[PDB]
Every structure is written in C-alpha cells, then in structure tokens.
Amino acid sequence: NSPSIDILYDYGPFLKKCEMTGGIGSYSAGTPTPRVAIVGAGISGLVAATELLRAGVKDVVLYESRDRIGGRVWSQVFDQTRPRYIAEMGAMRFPPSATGLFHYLKKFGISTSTTFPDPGVVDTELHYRGKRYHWPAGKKPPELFRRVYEGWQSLLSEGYLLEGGSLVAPLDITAMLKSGRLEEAAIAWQGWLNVFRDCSFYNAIVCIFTGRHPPGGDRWARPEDFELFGSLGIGSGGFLPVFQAGFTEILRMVINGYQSDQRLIPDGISSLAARLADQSFDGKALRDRVCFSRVGRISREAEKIIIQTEAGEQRVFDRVIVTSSNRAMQMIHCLTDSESFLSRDVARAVRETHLTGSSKLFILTRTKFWIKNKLPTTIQSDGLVRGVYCLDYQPDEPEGHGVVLLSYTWEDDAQKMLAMPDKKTRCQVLVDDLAAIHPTFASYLLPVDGDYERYVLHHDWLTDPHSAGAFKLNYPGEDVYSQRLFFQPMTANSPNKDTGLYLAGCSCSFAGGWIEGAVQTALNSACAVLRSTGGQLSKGNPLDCINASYRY
Amino acid sequence: NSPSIDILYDYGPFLKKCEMTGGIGSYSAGTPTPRVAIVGAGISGLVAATELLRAGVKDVVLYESRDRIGGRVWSQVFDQTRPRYIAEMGAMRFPPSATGLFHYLKKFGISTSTTFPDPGVVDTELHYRGKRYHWPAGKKPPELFRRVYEGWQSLLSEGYLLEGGSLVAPLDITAMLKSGRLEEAAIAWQGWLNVFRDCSFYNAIVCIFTGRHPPGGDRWARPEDFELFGSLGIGSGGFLPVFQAGFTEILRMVINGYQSDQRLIPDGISSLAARLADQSFDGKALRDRVCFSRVGRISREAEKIIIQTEAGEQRVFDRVIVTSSNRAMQMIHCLTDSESFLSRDVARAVRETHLTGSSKLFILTRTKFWIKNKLPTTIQSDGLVRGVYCLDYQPDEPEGHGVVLLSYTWEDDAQKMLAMPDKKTRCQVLVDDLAAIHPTFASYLLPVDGDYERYVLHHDWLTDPHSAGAFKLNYPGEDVYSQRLFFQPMTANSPNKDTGLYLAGCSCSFAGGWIEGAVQTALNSACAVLRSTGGQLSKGNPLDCINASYRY
C-alpha cells in the first residue's frame, strides 16, 4: 500500500473495498436524501458527485462556469478530425503512487502503461548559459551537473546530519510508508517539519549543501551549483521558479513518490472526466446533472444553503461542496466575510493560500521530427522556453504527426508570457529564443500547413478567471493552511462546527497540483455530506481513519 | 549627506556641484559628440537625456511605447474638467533621503512639504480577523500589535545578537552613513549580508524573534505574532505579501531611510516628468526628442547600434541606454540571446530579476468624508482591500471632492484582482469587503454622480505590457543581480567590455521601485555614454567614486 505522509492513510484500499459493497456509505431504506450542490465540474466535483450518487443521494447538481466539464484537466484537441493529437493544457504526468487517482483510472480502463518523457528518461538536452549539454536516455546527467545530481540523490538516500540529531532519509520514510510503519514515518516526517517548516526550497538546499555535512560529500559552490541545480531539477524539469516554495512541499512530493515513475495517458487525461461524466445513475448520466451556470454568492439562511447563479436565479440546497479556487471562495462565493460557513482560521487559509502561475504553448508539427533526426525528445532551458517536451501519441506510427509542448513555465517564467497573448506572436518569440542555441531543432517548429491559428494552442492559468492560478504550492510557514483546508470537511464529525458547507479540490489538499489531491478531498467532502445528513459511512472511511497529528 | 548603503555614495552633492558648472561632463573642442538613443521616456530616460544634453551631446532621441511620457510615474486624472483630482497609479510616496530624486524635485519647484498619510502618521485603523483596531495619529499601534511593533523597533535600534557575531543596529548603520563613517558602515552591512543573504523576510524574522535572542527580550508566538506583524508592517502598510522577498531588500530600505518621513506631492509626481520634458536645450524642448514608437530588436552592426521600431522603421546610433523592463530587455530587445551586448552573468540577472505585481483602484467621492466624521484616514486590512488611503488634494477647501485609494495591493494580493477587470465590479467587491468590518465607512464609497466609469480608476501593473511588472524586489540570494545591473554601465570604464549599450531604470538599481533608483542608474548610464565616447567626467562622478565591492 501507499499511504501519503501527511495523513498516514491510503485511499486505494478503502475505494477497492467500497467498489464491491455499495459505495462509501448509505442511508436506511425510506430515507429522504439531501439536495446537494457541488460547485465545479472538475475531477473533484465529479468524483464527489459520483460517490454521493453511488451512496444513494438522489438529487445532486453540479455547477460549472466554463463551457466544458473537466476544469484543470484539459486534453485540448487541435482538430476533431484527428482527435488523437491533443494538447494537455493542465494535468499531464501521472504517478502510480497517487492511488486515489489510479483507482479511477484503472476502473475506467484508462491506460497508464507508457512512461512520461521526463528529463533523464528520454534523450534530453539541458541548455545553460549559451551551451547545449547532452543527457542520454536512462543515463546520469552531463558531468557539469553531476555534483548537484549526486548531492540531491545522496540527500534522498542518506538524510541530513544536524548536530542536535539527524534527519531520516526521504527514501527511508517512503519505505516506512510502504511497509505499514506509520508511527515511525510520522516521527521521521515531524523531524523534517521541525527543521524546515519556515525554509524555502532555496534556503534549505543552501543550508544543507554548503554547511558542515553536505550529502554527496561535496560542498556546493554558491551561486554556480545552485544555478545548475535550478536547471537540472529533481525529476520534473527545472525547479528554479519554485525555489521560493516551502521546502516541505518539495519533500512531501518526493516521499509520496510523485516524482517517481510518471506515466503518460495517450487517450488524454480528459478521458477520466468523460468517463466519470458518462456514468449512468437512476437512468441519468452524471453529465446531465451539470448545470452550466457560474455560481456567485453563497449564503446561509437557517439550516439551509443559498446559491446565487449568474442568471440571477437563486436555488437552495441542504449541503454544498465547493471545488472552485480559494480565490473564488473569497471573492465570488464570499465565504470569508464572516463565520457563517468557515472558522476564522480556515478563512485565513482560504484567503492566503498561494496559487502558482503556469503557462503552456503547444504546436502540432507535420512529423515527429525528433525521432529520425539527431534531436532531443526533451529540452530543459534557462531561456524563455524553459521546458520543452516532444510527445508521441501513436508510437506504432512513426510517420504520424508530432505534438510539441514548446514552452511549459511556472511562476515568474510564466508571468513573462503575460505580455504577448497573441499566440502567433508568442510562438515565434519562443521558437526564436530556442533557435538562438539550437537552430536545427527550432527549424522544425512550424505548425501543420503553416496555420498558427489552428495548430498552436496556448493557455495562461494565472489569468484564467475560472482558475485564478495554476495550482496551490505553499510558501514556508504555510503548510498549516493545507492542514486546515484538508481537514475542513471533518467538521461533519462535530455538529457544532458543521455549517453544511465543505471545501474540496486539490487546492484544499496536501497535494496541490496533483489530481490525487482532488480525489482525496472529493472523498472527504462526500463522506462529510453523508455523515452530516444522517447517513452512515463504510468502515475504513477517511473521516474516521485519518488521525494524523502533525505540527506545521 | 545621505549616501546609500550598497554604494556608499550620495548623488546629491555631485548633482549640486554639477548644476551650475556645466553638467556631469564635457567634450573638448575636437571631439565629436555621439548620436544616442534612449529606450523609454520614464524618469530614468528623461534624466539621462537631460544630463547628456547638459553635457553637450546634441543628438539624443528617446523612444517610448506608451501614449504618454513618465512610465511608472503616472498621476492619472479622473476628469479633465476637474484636473486637480488625481490618482497616483504608480509612484506615490517620496522619502527625503532619496537625494537623487529630491535634487530634481527641488530644481523644478515640485512641493514636497506635505507628509504622506502613512499608517500611524494619520488616524488609522487596522482591520484584522473581523475586528477593528484604532491607531490614533502619531501614537503607538493598538495593544494587540504592540509586541511585534516594539520587537521591530528593538531590532532597528539594538541590532541582532548572535554567537557567530552580533549585527550592528540598522539605525546605527544609518548614523554611520550620515556621519560619513563609510568604512565602518560597509563592515556593518556586509555582516548582515553574510547572515541573511539567502534568507527571506519571513524566515529571518522567524529566526530572529523565535530564537535565543529576540530583540526586546520578548519571543514572538508562531504563527500568531507573524500574522500580526504581516498586518502591521514597518512604515508602509501590511508587508505580508512581500514576506517571500529577500530580508536584505527589507533592511536596505530601512537603512537608506526610504521608510521614513514620506512626502506627498499634491501636483502629482507626473509633474516631474512634465518639468523634465519641458526643459529647453539648443532651441528644442526635451519633449520633442521623444519618438512615440515601440522599440523592438536591438542589434549590433559594425561598432554601431541598430534600433528597430514598430513601423518597420530603423535607425542607427553610436550609443544606447535601455530603461525598459528586464522582461522587455530579454523578450523584446533580445539582449540576452548572446554576449553581443551583455555578459552571461548580466544576462542572467536580466532574465531572472523578479518584478512584483501590484494594483491600485481609486474612487473620487463627492466629499472628504473622513475629515468631518470620526473616520480613519488610512485603513490596513487582512481582507481583500489591503491598503486604504484617503487623499486631500485641496486642504484649504474642506468642501472639495475626496480621492480614496480604495485598494493598494502587492504580489498575491494583487494577483487576486486579475479576474474581474471590470471596474464597477472590482470597486463594489472591494467596497463590500470593507463593509463587512466597517459599514459606516463603506457607505461613503460611492463615485461622484454614481459614475463608476468616470470616477473609478484602476491599474494592474503585472499585466501592463509596457511594464510587465510593478517593480523589482529580489528574492533571497538574488541581490547579486542588483549588483550586476547597477554596475553594468561601469563597463564604460573597460573598453574591452564596453559594448556601447548600457542598462538603466530602477529595476537595474539597488532601489527597485523607488524613483531614486531610476535617477542613480540614469546618472550612471549617462556618465557611461560620455566616457565611452571620449568626454571627461566631472570629479565626484559615480563611475569613478563608487568602489563598493560587497559580497551578496
């Protein structure tokens, strides 16, 4: 099994046992079920609705502000004539340790067999200060980057020597988790938290690798080695722009195996949303319970919940699950004006939780030019482009079309794309930036038929008003917000704290920016709805079985 | 004298000496003056052009992409029928310690007599966790905030005791500066740098105030006191959103006096750009040297610099000064794709320098409702509005219209505003947010004539494509970039490294987001042009006298 470190609990076993036996809970026969509203038809909203319907709730409606279901899962098609070629605007890489996510992938038969082309997994080039460095598939990175590669590796496997007592190897904390040693894992993790809770990624690695006991034996040169590490990353490409994030946010990804064995979904991750939506309950598809209307203010009148809709219409429900951004929760739903729905502590979590910026631009090329020619499959660059990924969506047809994620950027690197919103203009600027160092590669970056309107697709998540940010990533000192947001639906365990409204979505999880977070929070919030309204939960449920007590 | 800490040099006395002695430099009869381009007609550009023209460079042209001069200086008028009511979209508060800025303010007769209504200077309320806290003018802050107030004050006056070597009190370093103890000041500041170079604001105050030697002998509570302090700030309102910024950036503002005694300019800071542009040289106003065309790629042909503009037009120059954002320098001017104009080190500084986000919304109300009524003049809120400032633009007419800076936000707080770009919508959201805690105050927040189009003004600097960011504020470990950018014009001292292009603007200064920075770098880049082209500089010039070599 694979319990996550912050909760010491795996959703996989529970979901397996419940698939068999009638869902996450039930009501006695003849019981009138609550009218439930779910704000948002992303993965979290669809999963929650799914398990609520499976548990016996007759009336659930999902509100959606976009013209499509799926939210930050968005496998956009260039050309519906040729739907296999897709641009994954949002979620893209999927770790098998995300057992909550993988429960539903396995269920709907959405293949995760193929590995994702991460740097170091396929032929990779790192572009750094004008030079091209080669990183052969399945090999150690080029020699320049070796000190920092090995230093990070040694940190994962060796831990870190502090004088007042050392810290357990992340890879050992991972072994503990897989082997059911949960008290042991908890103590080891608290150890890290105590030391690095108020330290950024950059700050932490400075202390670790320039101090008295650097893992790997070599003490990192500053700033040179930190620039190198920033370009090399830790499995997902250059992490320079997230150097300001809490070091604990990085560690938990590693320990939870989210930087490991990433898979690609050739069918597109949108097929998870399609299949969830295609489920039929009581003769009616989930998709048909989606109301395409933006929700505004959410208010409380006695023991009931009032949803304002964009029509001006106003509908009342018994319980509501909210999966929109914490930004939407503050500014649109107005959930932070008072103590009507959330405590002051949780309201602070909602108001102050950090969402990243992120942008992507894709191009559909005539050919998969990188295969038969001399070229890298992936390029990680200190230039504008940042992360380049070449994608093969039909490996058995080597002469099919190419999909190139020409630029994938985070935070500042993405905030840069904000001027030049014209995708033609952005594309050519990016190609020209890449061409400064690898003109041979850039020469193939032309859209099919020279049509930039059709065969270039881009998106900035930060300025998307349906998202207001790409994904949550806590700064140092802010992990407690994840705790508060994750355990918010556990108010259903305490009728005096239970306002009938529960927060959900990966932004309210311990895994911001991972569909796993959406799934876990969906399960917690769906369970809360059942318990709050007199239903009984299946044994092993998260509301009773998560008892982790960390201090952040 | 007020020499700033990072350069140990004051621009004031030099500019005073040069004023009536023929500028910063001169050419012998027999030396031809260069043809110069300056990209950008903000304060930095205008000052540079001014001093080049004063030194007898006859051919200087300024390029400007906006529909106006002044850049991030922008005293926007609500209604030209009533032009005295202005909204300071950019620069707003001016510290007398900014002796470069004040040299020009004084020269042009721009009044700075009136003190800016900072938190604690005028009657103030802090709104925090749904409660109001009163802060009478000139008094200590409310009791809730007293411990963190006094903690900061003790840090400033005592410094920081640590075992490896205690750090001199910032107020003592400021004293060394003023008394001309520059060698002692440098040692003092280098000490702080050694300790906190790689530490964020939050991380530093955490170590300082939860450690063994909390200034004031009072240890702060985590997280409680850091939330209070995030709301309290250090003289400029709630600094919570800049908690990720390098501590050294916070310290240098304090030491340089930029947090003391801010002045308001009733005529609007835009009157500086106006007065600069109104100056006449060689029969021609500076303003008529401004070419309103966006500069694209900048290139090198022979030993000349080619400027591309937005028509397809193109001009050739001997020397160029670039004051546009680092983002423009990388993506528009393409200064970073090679070592044509900038070293790899300076190119990195250009690419990786952090610009903040920041937004303002102003409303013009029928009356100065805060004067007659009990109401605070300033509010600092943990809510959506963050910073609220009431502005009196005709103090002798108590019946005049009032200007309210309804919301002034930075970083994440400003990033929240990017959805809802409609100003009626944004205005009412902010007003509603404030009304939750102070409904009486909010009842006055109505635009004149109820016209939200005419009497509300707002700007998001982050998505402004002429700025691509509000102002520069280094993260931990990035102060080296400020050094690199500030000293780039000193390449004129080295003909081997002199590429004929020089960087300027506050973004390239040690004073990111202060006009002082734009002035300092303007004087530097002008001196560079002169020396590079065979003119001699007046004694006391920054190219010769700035010899600080700190380790960042």
Ligand SMILES: Cc1cc2nc3c(=O)[nH]c(=O)nc-3n(C[C@H](O)[C@H](O)[C@H](O)COP(=O)(O)OP(=O)(O)OC[C@H]3O[C@@H](n4cnc5c(N)ncnc54)[C@H](O)[C@@H]3O)c2cc1C
């Ligand atoms: C760039 C990017 C890359 C990512 N990479 C990965 C990855 O590699 N692997 C991975 O597992 N995950 C990845 N993620 C994270 C993943 O996409 C999310 O964890 C997942 O989509 C969770 O969705 P959710 O349901 O929690 O929220 P969402 O998907 O955002 O769903 C919320 C829904 O609410 C709707 N809404 C908003 N406002 C209203 C309103 N006012 N009224 C009604 N509806 C409203 C929105 O339209 C949205 O559809 C990535 C995300 C981004 C952005």
Ligand SMILES: Cc1cc2nc3c(=O)[nH]c(=O)nc-3n(C[C@H](O)[C@H](O)[C@H](O)COP(=O)(O)OP(=O)(O)OC[C@H]3O[C@@H](n4cnc5c(N)ncnc54)[C@H](O)[C@@H]3O)c2cc1C
């Ligand atoms: C929100 C905010 C608040 C501030 N508050 C204060 C304060 O209280 N006190 C203080 O002293 N300072 C403050 N500042 C900082 C102050 O505004 C700056 O230091 C100063 O205005 C910058 O002048 P500059 O010439 O260096 O840069 P800019 O003013 O940015 O000048 C650059 C010029 O180049 C132009 N340009 C851009 N691209 C091109 C192009 N491609 N081709 C041709 N031209 C181009 C731009 O339009 C702009 O006019 C504040 C700034 C902001 C943003």
Ligand SMILES: NC(=O)Cc1c[nH]c2ccccc12
């Ligand atoms: N699933 C992802 O790779 C997105 C993401 C989540 N957390 C991150 C931290 C840094 C960079 C990307 C991410």
Ligand SMILES: NC(=O)Cc1c[nH]c2ccccc12
């Ligand atoms: N002159 C200003 O107030 C803007 C500014 C410069 N540096 C800052 C740091 C934090 C907040 C504002 C600023």
